């Protein structure tokens, strides 16, 4: 095809979180933590194949890890990517 | 190679429960062991708000040194110490003082 | 009044960064000493 079926392990988790997620459900589109190296087109494919839905276009943004806690030293979390996916019309999941 | 093991009957050797006997409920990474009914303590367990919330005093088993329990003979009714080897196919444990094997 | 540290990352990296450090026999000895000292930040970079 263009992207091997193997590499459609880019979808990592739904981000069903906040009205941001759900209130932007009730007006098209779904959002997801997705890989890190994922290429919009590369992640559209995943959502076509798996999930078997339609997809108009996909937007991406990177979330930066909050650094916190600790006394002297310090701990930081990992960065990760957001989805915001926007399905064509016969919208299901 | 452990001279004492999981299901296994022993007589306490030192302290508190000097003379008592019991089965090894389970043995620990530390080389300490829990012998059922044997070395008891009274944990004041705290309540936890989200379910299993009541909490209360609880009598419970407290790990103790394997150095301080001996395997029990039954044939003689005393502590016996262990030893190794047949040359059978396996190894197995025999009571010292009568190669009695078990 | 204007004080001595006027931060600027471009200058920072260009003057003290890994590659700059790497571009000179002595700059390299700089790292070598810091490695031998077991330093956690060889050169304060991104």
């Amino acid at each position: 095809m263009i992207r091997e079926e193997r590499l459609l392990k880019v979808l990592r988790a739904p981000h069903v979180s906040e009205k941001a997620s759900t209130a932007m459900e009730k007006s098209n589109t779904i959002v997801l933590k997705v890989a890190k190296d994922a290429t919009k087109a590369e992640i559209k494919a995943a959502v076509q194949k798996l999930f078997e839905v339609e997809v108009e276009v996909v937007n991406t943004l990177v979330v930066k890890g909050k650094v916190k806690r600790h006394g002297q030293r310090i701990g930081r979390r990992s960065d990760w990517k957001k989805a915001y996916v926007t399905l064509k019309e016969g919208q299901n999941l | 190679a452990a001279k004492i093991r999981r299901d296994d009957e022993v007589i306490v050797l030192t302290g508190k429960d000097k003379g008592k006997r019991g089965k090894v409920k389970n043995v620990l990474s530390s080389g300490k062991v829990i012998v059922e009914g044997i070395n008891l303590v009274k944990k004041h367990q705290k309540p936890v708000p989200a379910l299993n919330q009541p909490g209360g005093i609880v009598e419970k088993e407290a790990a103790i040194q394997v150095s301080n329990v001996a395997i029990f003979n039954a044939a003689t009714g005393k502590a016996d110490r262990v030893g190794f080897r047949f040359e059978d196919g396996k190894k197995v444990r025999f009571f010292k003082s009568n190669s009695e094997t078990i | 009044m204007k004080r001595t540290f006027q931060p600027s990352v471009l200058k920072r990296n260009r003057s003290h960064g890994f590659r700059a450090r790497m571009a000179t026999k002595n700059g390299r000895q700089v790292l070598a000493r810091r490695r031998a000292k077991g330093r956690a930040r060889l050169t304060v970079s991104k």
Binding site: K9, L11, R12, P14, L50 | - | -
Partner: protein
């Protein structure tokens, strides 16, 4: 689960290969993350299974 497929055919294996991912692994992540998956240890194996899968096939072909 090792020699069980030491002899399982280079082409054939790439099947379970996908079947570990194609099914178990992807479904498991999704299902898990979504708060379903009550038996977490399934994530440990599958991943470890794919490792086996790829250990052969790599050692069968070419190496």
């Amino acid at each position: 689960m090792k020699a069980k497929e030491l002899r399982e055919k280079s082409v054939e294996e790439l099947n379970t290969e996908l079947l570990n991912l194609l099914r178990e692994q992807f479904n498991l992540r999704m299902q898990a993350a979504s708060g379903q998956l009550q038996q977490s240890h399934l994530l440990k194996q599958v991943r470890r299974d794919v490792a086996r899968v790829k250990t052969l096939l790599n050692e069968k072909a070419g190496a």
